[PDB]
Design an enzyme around this catalytic site. Structure first.
Site, PDB file in Angstrom:
ATOM      1  N   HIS A  10       1.173  -0.987   0.549  1.00  0.00           N
ATOM      2  CA  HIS A  10       0.100   0.043  -0.207  1.00  0.00           C
ATOM      3  C   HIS A  10       0.856   1.105  -0.261  1.00  0.00           C
ATOM      4  CE1 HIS A  10      -4.257  -1.924   1.088  1.00  0.00           C
ATOM      5  NE2 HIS A  10      -2.798  -3.297   1.502  1.00  0.00           N
ATOM      6  N   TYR A  24      -8.320   5.079   7.890  1.00  0.00           N
ATOM      7  CA  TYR A  24      -8.989   5.516   9.794  1.00  0.00           C
ATOM      8  C   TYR A  24      -9.817   6.283   9.716  1.00  0.00           C
ATOM      9  CZ  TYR A  24      -4.235   3.185  10.271  1.00  0.00           C
ATOM     10  OH  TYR A  24      -3.512   2.782  10.161  1.00  0.00           O
ATOM     11  N   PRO A  50      -2.877   1.087  19.099  1.00  0.00           N
ATOM     12  CA  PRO A  50      -2.535   0.161  17.903  1.00  0.00           C
ATOM     13  C   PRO A  50      -2.827   0.878  16.837  1.00  0.00           C
ATOM     14  CG  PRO A  50      -4.907  -0.353  18.943  1.00  0.00           C
ATOM     15  CD  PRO A  50      -3.824  -0.088  19.947  1.00  0.00           C
ATOM     16  N   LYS A 109       2.644   0.736  15.230  1.00  0.00           N
ATOM     17  CA  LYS A 109       3.755   0.690  15.608  1.00  0.00           C
ATOM     18  C   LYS A 109       4.230  -0.228  16.390  1.00  0.00           C
ATOM     19  CE  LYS A 109       4.425   3.164  12.391  1.00  0.00           C
ATOM     20  NZ  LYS A 109       3.312   3.053  11.635  1.00  0.00           N
ATOM     21  N   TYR A 126       4.747   7.013   9.723  1.00  0.00           N
ATOM     22  CA  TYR A 126       3.825   5.824   9.539  1.00  0.00           C
ATOM     23  C   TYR A 126       4.738   4.976   9.237  1.00  0.00           C
ATOM     24  CZ  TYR A 126      -0.497   3.247   8.649  1.00  0.00           C
ATOM     25  OH  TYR A 126      -1.252   1.966   8.445  1.00  0.00           O
TER      26      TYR A 126
HETATM   27  C1  FAD Z   1       0.403  -3.154  12.602  1.00  0.00           C
HETATM   28  C2  FAD Z   1       0.282  -3.402  13.228  1.00  0.00           C
HETATM   29  C3  FAD Z   1      -0.914  -3.542  14.336  1.00  0.00           C
HETATM   30  C4  FAD Z   1      -0.228  -4.246  15.031  1.00  0.00           C
HETATM   31  N1  FAD Z   1      -1.977  -4.909  15.862  1.00  0.00           N
HETATM   32  C5  FAD Z   1      -1.461  -5.682  17.379  1.00  0.00           C
HETATM   33  C6  FAD Z   1      -3.111  -5.986  17.843  1.00  0.00           C
HETATM   34  O1  FAD Z   1      -4.135  -5.489  17.621  1.00  0.00           O
HETATM   35  N2  FAD Z   1      -2.738  -6.427  19.678  1.00  0.00           N
HETATM   36  C7  FAD Z   1      -1.922  -6.543  19.885  1.00  0.00           C
HETATM   37  O2  FAD Z   1      -1.538  -7.441  21.190  1.00  0.00           O
HETATM   38  N3  FAD Z   1      -0.628  -6.142  18.917  1.00  0.00           N
HETATM   39  C8  FAD Z   1      -1.244  -5.538  17.926  1.00  0.00           C
HETATM   40  N4  FAD Z   1       0.708  -5.372  17.272  1.00  0.00           N
HETATM   41  C9  FAD Z   1       2.178  -5.891  17.917  1.00  0.00           C
HETATM   42  C10 FAD Z   1       2.419  -7.436  17.953  1.00  0.00           C
HETATM   43  O3  FAD Z   1       0.867  -7.954  18.964  1.00  0.00           O
HETATM   44  C11 FAD Z   1       3.520  -7.185  19.331  1.00  0.00           C
HETATM   45  O4  FAD Z   1       4.075  -6.151  18.697  1.00  0.00           O
HETATM   46  C12 FAD Z   1       4.232  -8.550  18.894  1.00  0.00           C
HETATM   47  O5  FAD Z   1       3.360  -9.261  19.552  1.00  0.00           O
HETATM   48  C13 FAD Z   1       5.555  -8.092  19.775  1.00  0.00           C
HETATM   49  O6  FAD Z   1       6.433  -9.527  19.547  1.00  0.00           O
HETATM   50  P1  FAD Z   1       6.370 -10.160  20.763  1.00  0.00           P
HETATM   51  O7  FAD Z   1       7.441 -11.398  20.094  1.00  0.00           O
HETATM   52  O8  FAD Z   1       6.865  -9.849  21.660  1.00  0.00           O
HETATM   53  O9  FAD Z   1       4.857 -10.818  20.533  1.00  0.00           O
HETATM   54  P2  FAD Z   1       4.278 -12.469  21.085  1.00  0.00           P
HETATM   55  O10 FAD Z   1       3.187 -12.664  19.884  1.00  0.00           O
HETATM   56  O11 FAD Z   1       3.684 -11.755  22.059  1.00  0.00           O
HETATM   57  O12 FAD Z   1       5.544 -13.419  21.190  1.00  0.00           O
HETATM   58  C14 FAD Z   1       6.178 -14.125  22.661  1.00  0.00           C
HETATM   59  C15 FAD Z   1       5.096 -15.775  23.250  1.00  0.00           C
HETATM   60  O13 FAD Z   1       6.280 -15.330  24.288  1.00  0.00           O
HETATM   61  C16 FAD Z   1       5.368 -16.738  24.569  1.00  0.00           C
HETATM   62  N5  FAD Z   1       5.345 -17.007  26.270  1.00  0.00           N
HETATM   63  C17 FAD Z   1       4.874 -15.631  27.156  1.00  0.00           C
HETATM   64  N6  FAD Z   1       5.072 -16.237  28.469  1.00  0.00           N
HETATM   65  C18 FAD Z   1       5.780 -17.185  28.698  1.00  0.00           C
HETATM   66  C19 FAD Z   1       7.077 -17.547  29.215  1.00  0.00           C
HETATM   67  N7  FAD Z   1       6.281 -17.170  30.674  1.00  0.00           N
HETATM   68  N8  FAD Z   1       8.195 -18.688  28.693  1.00  0.00           N
HETATM   69  C20 FAD Z   1       8.306 -19.137  27.460  1.00  0.00           C
HETATM   70  N9  FAD Z   1       7.572 -17.976  26.005  1.00  0.00           N
HETATM   71  C21 FAD Z   1       5.864 -17.714  27.214  1.00  0.00           C
HETATM   72  C22 FAD Z   1       3.532 -16.095  24.161  1.00  0.00           C
HETATM   73  O14 FAD Z   1       3.032 -17.469  24.048  1.00  0.00           O
HETATM   74  C23 FAD Z   1       4.032 -15.679  22.910  1.00  0.00           C
HETATM   75  O15 FAD Z   1       3.370 -16.407  21.887  1.00  0.00           O
HETATM   76  C24 FAD Z   1       0.672  -4.320  16.140  1.00  0.00           C
HETATM   77  C25 FAD Z   1       1.901  -4.204  15.353  1.00  0.00           C
HETATM   78  C26 FAD Z   1       2.008  -3.550  14.455  1.00  0.00           C
HETATM   79  C27 FAD Z   1       3.324  -3.618  13.583  1.00  0.00           C
END
Ligand code: FAD
Ligand code: FAD
Ligand code: FAD
Lengths: 394, 394, 394, 394
Positions: C78, C206, C297, C301, C389
């Site tokens: 996009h 939006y 959200p 970011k 953005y």
């Molecule tokens: C355009 C955009 C839209 C977004 N929209 C959303 C949205 O609607 N909702 C949202 O929530 N985020 C949203 N995000 C952000 C995104 O979900 C997070 O930034 C992302 O989860 C970060 O990476 P992570 O690996 O920390 O995430 P995660 O997916 O949280 O990965 C962490 C993993 O660790 C596991 N875990 C937890 N505790 C433990 C433990 N004690 N031991 C071992 N493993 C464990 C969990 O099961 C999980 O699978 C968006 C981001 C962008 C860029």
């Protein structure tokens, strides 16, 4: 002219501070040989001005041991203190609440008292010594030093007590594997000034305000000792007498109280931390006073702690040198550190309650004001505070 | 549009929890018509089993208002509690120290009594409503809701009282610019279980240990209520009755005291934070209870706070509807929040003193043991603790 | 204690999220031992339906690392977005303004790629583990865990990295005194639906209306991804597909634009807050992704931030493991926190600009519309919006 | 009852302030009779010291209309400004970014220019008049007034325009049911001082710091005008010139930058709030200037907004009185309010970015620095800031 002379004592004591000199004198009066080495001149120690607040017990130790009763003549007894916050001053009445008082007597005067007492009693205290090292800690220990005249000595004793202060050299000699350090550092310090002026209050004023914490306290009738909370890295040279007094007015002045003000005769910024080295005995090294711990100044618990330490250590040494018992020396660390944590906790509680949390955490400031109100508003609160301040008589 | 029926009340109350129902009943007994909307079933509400510890004043309010004396019949009065650490159990004797007692009575039982009392008097209490909105807060407020049978209604009131609890809808309807939100979130939660066995002590035991904190508290003779400190995101299904009893054993058992054990009949993870919405009135919406604040459960001040909230709000409401004075309504926020911060401070103190600092904070843990000692060791300390626990009587 | 099998790696990774798995793959491709532990099943993760908006750079990292080029095939590029307010839709042309684009590609597909890639290459990714504990963080760390089959392991590493997500276990293990938590909670949430329907516009919409905010976004060709602003505790149970489509209609439709509509195939309410844990390194535990921070959200970011974290952290780890240099690790928190607050500020701005201020602030709503006009009316403004953005290209 | 002399004009102008006089003169040169009543003496108006920051447009309106070209000779053109935060000064280059400038020329000088111009060209500006009443507004209006000499008049015209300033009398005569008011108040004010000194910088310096906000501004080359953020209720009397300059150093000085200073020759504190009266036309009374709105001083947008208002008001009057079309007169309110909201939002944004939020919201302060960094580091951001600062050229 090249001989490193061997001289004998029973207790090697490192430090001509209050704790070292007090231990020296109690050992003297119980008839145990003590030699005390210090790296500063007597004058350096006397020109270093730290104010002092002595608990009932510390004043009793200075007196009932014969060290010096001038504390009773020249130091002022106070029956309470006051917490200033939200424009109100509340009075914690030590005598009404716990029946103890405290005595405000500069710590350097305690030093002068004790050093003069030892000299007049021909005690062995060597000032301005150098090249100081410690050996054979778990054996019969040995202290290497070069006295003030340039002569070299190996001093041999049964035990060493290191009363080196917070820059302790003796405690640096302990292997890390056999010790544990407890630390907690604060984001502020005290800006402390000695200023010529009449009593702006009779008692100590601890005050808490949006702009910070400040203590209104006394040293002379001519000179008063004041502190206010500041950034750890402030340079006193970038401070005008006007600016100092402005900070003091913004924290203390108002609501029917005005702070008397005078010429700023000394100013210095004074950092602090919570520190605890445990256990306080390694081998035949015993640590006492600020060599072994330090506390935030809020509680006034530092010099009290050191004197307490030397007292309990001395009781151990006398038990041993009178009956050969090791039970008290082994219990030295336990007994001392027990009180040390009590004091750490109390000085911590005082610090937390009075200094405004640097940087404006709002739930924090709210909770702090809540606590201050509950303490001043509850008789049980004021009593608990007074008990801790005046030395836990019980 | 199709017609949503338009009805009037004088006070529309959002929430059929204890604070909502207690205010409804008090407005009734003073002859002020109040209509209560709730989003859960009566049954949903009653299957939520939270224990409760009622200060004297809450019990007096429940009784002298006619709400229910069943608190006196089915709830047990306790005269003290015990803080357990390092294998010793110390007892705070509330009646000896401050001359108050407290009453152990399940919060859901209080809800049951109050709900029944409202039904029995014909009070308007509508459960299981939806589409809930709040409008014209600075005008004559309006509550839109779709009641249980599907009818859409606009309620018009003189004031709205928001008693939605911590999932409050009302506090979200107050403009961000005109309020302030206060926070402090903890790095632990509570694991709460109901297990069938007789009481392992007479009174409540709060215990602090290397492995964590645990609370031994009573609900029935048949069922006991226990909690232990846990990670905020612990999942109960990854735990066995054996594993739960292990955590309890390692924290509480020892030195001639053994924890009775039974079948594990409920287990649940119970999160908490400290939150405060200020001021507690916006326009003609008044907030009370978990709508306006929340506490760590340790101090037991949450439902007590709620009752205090509704009591002061009712007095304001009465003053106004009888004599037209707004003074009491205008001072509601001050009175309420004054007590609320008192409880905030106390519940924080209890929490920090008994929960074990996660992460091997060595200075933190050392000071914690020091503080616990100072408190159980001083009669003033236990007195201050008891004063706050029982509700700041005097 | 039944011997828990002891295994060593160089980097222990907590979290099989995109950030964790991507860290694993970057460590692998530079040949560094990385072991990843997870508490969820791979299928559970895959049933997690999150859409995604990728900055140019994120797509570059996904490709140029070999993780997966599937992003380019199945995800669509996009060149802009449209801001809908006052019934008019204005278009921000990313490519025209800053000359960058963004790529709309479900985040779950990124998880799939990273899971498949680690699995298809040497796979150190353990799913559905339990009994997660962390120890000796300032030393050589240790992770205890009980894998899916019941095996207990003590894993020993040189560093731990926490990518646990917002339900992080690691951030709860860093001592409260050595961290700070930053918060901001909003008075709304998102009600998100997946519905079968044709694309109603080219780009994401939006949209801001008197009735609330709504975002029209794409996930599949069959399925469109929709959100509307709602009360933080809204329950879909009290919601019919007709009522959902009414909310979207009153928020988006008008002036000759109508939203295509279909069956409501999933509905879920989505809470969010701004949160920041600093510093992002404590000892040899490093925190990344939603483990260390979270954002609203509106700006898209979040996952971008997570990937940025892992990239900068991996670079520190490689610099260190190649030359023994700590500098890149030591400044890790600095760089990450810089970018993180930039994202925080941007996401706050987007949220504050687009959601309707709860409670009828007349001044707030007027100021909001003033801002929206001034933004779409100025070329510099739209360029600033587009720059932030698309990831701050430059 | 005594007869008030009857006099005629076409446009009744209430206020010989900048906007009133500017409307007068535009009417004059377009051949429409203007009669102006004012409540202050000419010396009274001229003694009002407001500094002034004139947009591109105000300078064009002042010059090309013949009011007075003295602004270009005697007012200094500034082509950028400096944002000082975190000890760093970044420069917004107005000329580089949007290619317009602004002119620092005191508002008192503009009054002198416009008043002298009306007098010399034949003009009705009646100073020190009293006994103001206004009648039959939605018809052909009538105004009663008493000049300084006691003459009684009823002046009758086709329209009345109110330029009374923010203490406006005209807007208080509009029925509340026929209007809407928008308000929002800030928790601070400006401490504004006039002090004799050379330029400490070339351009204006807006500085944001822990200790507050501060603006370094000019009126003369000899005299400088300065502000710093403070309590709405602070008394210059309890202030020393030394103490004032201390506040300024703590906010601006550092990193090798020192503020030149001299003795403080005037001091006054400036409260401020946002206000908007809509619609700005009720009947045949038209509102312009601070009669109809107010802004935070942060943008300097007050006098600029006023001038814009009068310009559109005159153009409406011209369309109608020349071709009889009411299109410009009927739509005046809409346009004026559109730009007014633009300026409201701009002043709001500048304040939130620059003032240190009283009381320490910590996430707030972090986000504030995040915003400041994102803006100074982006060319689009600085350009958008410059665009709004310089007057929205277009
Ligand atoms: C355009 C955009 C839209 C977004 N929209 C959303 C949205 O609607 N909702 C949202 O929530 N985020 C949203 N995000 C952000 C995104 O979900 C997070 O930034 C992302 O989860 C970060 O990476 P992570 O690996 O920390 O995430 P995660 O997916 O949280 O990965 C962490 C993993 O660790 C596991 N875990 C937890 N505790 C433990 C433990 N004690 N031991 C071992 N493993 C464990 C969990 O099961 C999980 O699978 C968006 C981001 C962008 C860029
Ligand atoms: C009311 C009150 C207020 C206080 N306020 C403060 C305050 O503001 N700031 C603060 O820092 N402390 C403060 N303290 C603590 C007090 O200053 C310390 O006790 C003080 O350092 C004296 O130490 P000591 O004799 O108690 O312990 P010791 O361990 O005996 O220390 C004695 C001092 O002698 C010196 N010394 C001893 N032997 C040697 C050696 N061999 N070489 C070099 N130096 C040596 C040390 O530097 C040491 O400071 C306060 C105490 C009280 C009761
Ligand atoms: C483990 C634990 C131990 C505790 N121990 C104690 C203790 O010893 N002593 C003590 O005093 N307290 C104790 N508490 C209580 C705790 O402190 C709570 O803060 C207290 O219960 C106050 O909550 P509440 O039930 O009064 O909610 P309230 O403020 O009274 O109201 C909650 C009600 O609002 C309803 N509601 C929600 N949303 C809406 C809506 N939109 N419209 C209408 N209705 C709505 C809900 O259905 C619910 O019934 C404990 C709590 C826990 C979890």
């Amino acid at each position: 002219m090249a001989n490193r002379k061997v001289i004998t004592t029973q207790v090697a004591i490192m430090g001509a501070g209050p704790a070292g000199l007090m231990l020296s004198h109690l050992l003297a009066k119980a008839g145990i040989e003590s030699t005390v080495i210090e790296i500063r001149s007597h004058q350096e120690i006397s020109e270093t001005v730290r104010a002092g607040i002595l608990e009932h017990g510390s004043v009793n130790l200075l007196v009932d041991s014969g060290a010096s009763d001038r504390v009773l003549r020249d130091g002022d007894r106070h029956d309470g203190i006051e917490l200033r916050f939200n424009g109100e001053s509340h009075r914690i009445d030590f005598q009404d609440l716990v029946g103890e008082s405290v005595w405000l007597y500069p710590q350097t005067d305690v030093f002068l008292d004790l050093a003069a007492r030892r000299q007049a009693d021909g005690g062995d205290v060597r000032y301005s010594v150098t090249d100081t090292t410690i050996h054979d800690l778990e054996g019969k220990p040995k202290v290497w030093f070069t006295d003030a005249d340039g002569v070299e000595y190996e001093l041999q004793a049964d035990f060493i007590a290191g009363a080196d202060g917070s820059r302790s050299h003796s405690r640096f000699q302990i292997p890390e594997a056999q010790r544990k350090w407890y630390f907690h550092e604060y984001p502020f310090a005290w800006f402390g000034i000695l200023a010529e002026t009449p009593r702006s209050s009779d008692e100590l004023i601890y005050a808490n305000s949006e702009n910070g914490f400040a203590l209104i306290s006394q040293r002379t009738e001519t000179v008063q000792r004041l502190y206010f909370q500041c950034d750890p890295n402030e340079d006193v040279n970038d401070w005008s007498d006007d600016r100092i007094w402005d900070a003091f007015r913004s924290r203390v002045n108002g609501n029917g109280f005005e702070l008397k003000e005078g010429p700023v005769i000394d100013k210095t910024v004074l950092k602090f931390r919570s520190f605890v080295h445990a256990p306080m005995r390694h081998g035949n090294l015993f640590l006492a006073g600020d060599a072994a711990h330090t506390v935030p100044p809020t509680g006034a618990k530092g010099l009290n702690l050191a004197l307490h330490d030397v007292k309990v250590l001395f009781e151990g040494f006398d038990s041993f040198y009178k009956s050969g018992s090791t039970a008290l020396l082994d219990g030295y660390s336990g007994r001392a550190l027990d009180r040390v944590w009590k004091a750490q906790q109390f000085s911590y509680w005082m610090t937390s309650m009075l200094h405004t949390p640097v940087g404006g955490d709002d739930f924090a400031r709210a909770r702090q004001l809540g606590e201050l109100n509950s303490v001043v508003s509850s008789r049980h609160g004021r009593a608990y505070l007074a008990e801790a301040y005046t030395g836990w008589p019980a």
